[PDB]
């Protein structure tokens, strides 16, 4: 009954159904009058530890199959030839079966990362022309959609299994075996708790667990020459299932009353998400003058939300990509969003993302489509997502039906009031307590239209110059910017 | 065992086999040369293969059956072509050695250019003889295959099969089940007739397969029924909310849709009817279309989603449309629901940018009808009826249905009521703020704003609702 964390109900049903039909001895099958199942296939999110489950299932099934492993290339050797190899590993099993065919020989073959002749070749051997039963094959792959339709139909690959999101209980099981083995030996860390580690991590793949533990062992080794495990949690992954420090370089200072209101509105939106059975997908956008500060805000809302899976989207990664490539990466993030039950994703600089250009205007249709469908597109039942898009220009986006898509729109306006500007200055703490007073004297009777990103940059600009100069220069700079 | 296909199968069977069967002077009295081959084209899952193996078995004590790999032509250098010629060669050799009477060889090509075309054609017919053998070809689509083979002679008879007859389906399930019956063990809950009524599409093969999954399932249990559970799981998502009926128009559209269905299924005169939904987003029309599809209970109903097609090349989108639609043809009748009509095009108002090629593929097919003995209904959802008419595609669609989201206050409250989110008091206040006035919001944003309001404290919910609805106007 070991070892595989979580995946017990689904695994149990699948297992008993594939193995049991074989297991009942021996008249029952004839009583059943049913030919044995040909293969079982599993598709999972990456890192869900599909492979370990498969090796284990194969081991459990027979005293010794004894396991057959297929290289990823599969088809290596061009001249004839490789195709023949894919046929050939099957060939040994079929040969044994013909030599002893009736009962009772089983051979297990597994293809990891599963066109022309090879498609057909696998299909012919797995089913027909005559027999080819008494063996089973399991295929493990990250995405269902990529694989061929013909294999799927009941028969050659009758049963398809989709791996469940990793269990908390399960997470406790995988960590529990390594930890326990350590427990069994006298050495252990008192501070570390199994339940606690499980509650702390939701996203991680199996693999991840051995990795975290291994890093902890290494740090411990370092101590000899929380603790090590904590250091590992802090660094080691690389999980693949969010750095906000790269999107909030400058702190969400409560510069203006509007700032607090934009964030509370972000709070309102997350709260909207929390249940939202009636609406599965939450779409939100921030619209601001350039240098608006909308995007840091979006990132901050995401940090605040702490939904189980958050992945940042960057214009910068997209740069220099083919329009199709741009669509593709974006697609991959979209499916990644699918995995979490409650989830938040960021789309940023969408005008920039689109490659939208003022002259023309010229823009990317394919990119626009991926973007358009997504808001409309529905996450698998259960699991939900909120999308935050930061857009510099509201009207063009409204113009392409993009605005229509969003559930909520938030516009971030640069404060038009000097005193609020002052409040901002005070929070940033750039100017001396004298300078704040001076700015306060100047602002009255004057109207300011400047962005926080722009304001902070402006401030910073005024500051470098000498102290008598800073007050005058900043005022002049403000005047020019106005 | 072969489910359904007893009349058609019987006639075909008789015509190929009987002409051979009458012994032996009768054929000369007929004075007709024996038929060369029989070819069958079926929907996927039509169990063509089993019928063929069975037919071959039935025909001779032992042919004994020849199977052709899908590649057929594997080995480039000379060579493969020669192989396609060569399997024929053994049969011709036997026939020359004993030619007159009485040797028959059966060869079957599953999933049936240059030299191979000619090669198969030359061996099957001419130059001299080549009779005393028969070949059956099994393929999913008729249109793909070559014209030359089809003409009477080399492939005189072409058979098209409409899935498995209900009585027949009962026969195949009945044999495996009966064998199960004969032994003491059986499932009381499972009924033969019931299984037959439940399944229309499935191949024989499918039946042994289903039984297999269920047996495997009994097999799951010891250390309707199982079949029902399989229907429940083994192979809703689109409309998680379900549909409220706020206005007589909302209900009226689902009813009109039901009427379109009735017409499509019921009436011979028009093979096809097109159902069109007109709304401005964020309209719920997409949902209405799904509903329409569900009440119909058409044997095959498929709703196609752009996201499934997302990021595809022009050709790929077009191919998907072709595939779905080919799938629909094969069934006696079907309802196909088309979604995001603007998006398939990838129309963008700036530009204009759109893909013409895809537009022609949809436009041409829509007018197009399945082969006789079958009828279909196509439903599409369009954001922008005006742009569509401007294409002139709209003229092509059989019927137009338009709902402008929610337009009156009565319709609004009726929706809030069917959804049941606000308290009697709250709705009593909302009505006092909308009744008489004009509103204009699609159903889904409503489902959204409602949730955006349930988020505020028990007293700030109503006010927040009226604020949101005040913006979505
Ligand atoms: N209320 C706010 N919303 C967004 N960003 C803010 C806010 N207040 C302060 N910031 C700061 O603004 C900066 C980000 O500006 P950015 O997101 O690039 O704006 P834009 O997208 O309008 O160009 C961050 O460095 C962050 O510390």
From Swiss-Prot, chain A:
Substrates-to-products reaction catalysed: ATP + H2O = ADP + phosphate + H(+)
Phosphotyrosine-modified residues are 43
Record GO terms (molecular function):
ATP binding; ATP hydrolysis activity; ATP-dependent protein disaggregase activity; identical protein binding; ionotropic glutamate receptor binding; metal ion binding; PDZ domain binding; protein kinase binding
Any one Gene Ontology BP term: intracellular protein transport
In short, the EC number is 3.6.4.6
Modified sites of kind Phosphoserine: 314
Give the co-factor note.
Binds 1 Mg(2+) ion per subunit.
The compartments listed are: Cytoplasm
The Swiss-Prot or TrEMBL record lists the needed cofactor(s) as: Mg(2+)
| GO CC field | cytosol; Golgi stack; midbody; plasma membrane
- The disulfides recorded in the entry are none
Q: Which of this chain's residues are annotated to bind ATP?
A: 250-255, 290-297
Q: EC top class, in one word?
A: hydrolase
What is the name of this protein?
Vesicle-fusing ATPase
Question: Whose protein is this, by species?
Answer: Cricetulus griseus
Swiss-Prot record, chain B:
Posttranslational mods: Phosphorylation at Ser-305 interferes with homohexamerization.
An annotated Gene Ontology molecular function = ATP hydrolysis activity
Tell me, in a sentence or two, what this protein's role is: Required for vesicle-mediated transport. Catalyzes the fusion of transport vesicles within the Golgi cisternae. Is also required for transport from the endoplasmic reticulum to the Golgi stack. Seems to function as a fusion protein required for the delivery of cargo proteins to all compartments of the Golgi stack independent of vesicle origin. Interaction with AMPAR subunit GRIA2 leads to influence GRIA2 membrane cycling.
| Cofactor note text | Binds 1 Mg(2+) ion per subunit.
Residues given in the record as Mg(2+) binding sites: 286
* Location(s), subcellular: Cytoplasm
Would the keyword Cytoplasm turn up in this protein's UniProt record?
A: yes
Q: One GO cellular component from the entry?
A: cytosol
According to the record's subunit comment, the protein's assembly and interactions are: Homohexamer. Interacts with GABARAP and GABARAPL2. Interacts with GRIA2. Interacts with PLK2, leading to disrupt the interaction with GRIA2. Interacts with MUSK; may regulate MUSK endocytosis and activity. Interacts with CDK16.
Biological process annotations from GO: Golgi to plasma membrane protein transport; intra-Golgi vesicle-mediated transport; intracellular protein transport; positive regulation of protein catabolic process; positive regulation of receptor recycling; potassium ion transport; SNARE complex disassembly
Q: Which UniProt keywords apply?
A: Acetylation, ATP-binding, Cytoplasm, Hydrolase, Magnesium, Metal-binding, Nucleotide-binding, Phosphoprotein, Protein transport, Repeat, Transport
Q: Where does ATP bind?
A: 241-246, 281-288
Top-rank EC class of the record's enzyme: hydrolase
**Originating organism:** Cricetulus griseus
Q: What is the gene name? A: NSF
Q: Out of the domains of life, which is the source?
A: Eukaryota
Reactions mediated catalytically? ATP + H2O = ADP + phosphate + H(+)
Give residue numbers for the modification (Phosphotyrosine). Answer: 41
Q: Would I find Transport among this entry's keywords? A: yes
Provide the cofactor list for this protein: Mg(2+)
Q: What is the lineage of its organism?
A: Eukaryota, Metazoa, Chordata, Craniata, Vertebrata
- The name under which this protein is listed is Vesicle-fusing ATPase
Sites of Phosphoserine modification: 305
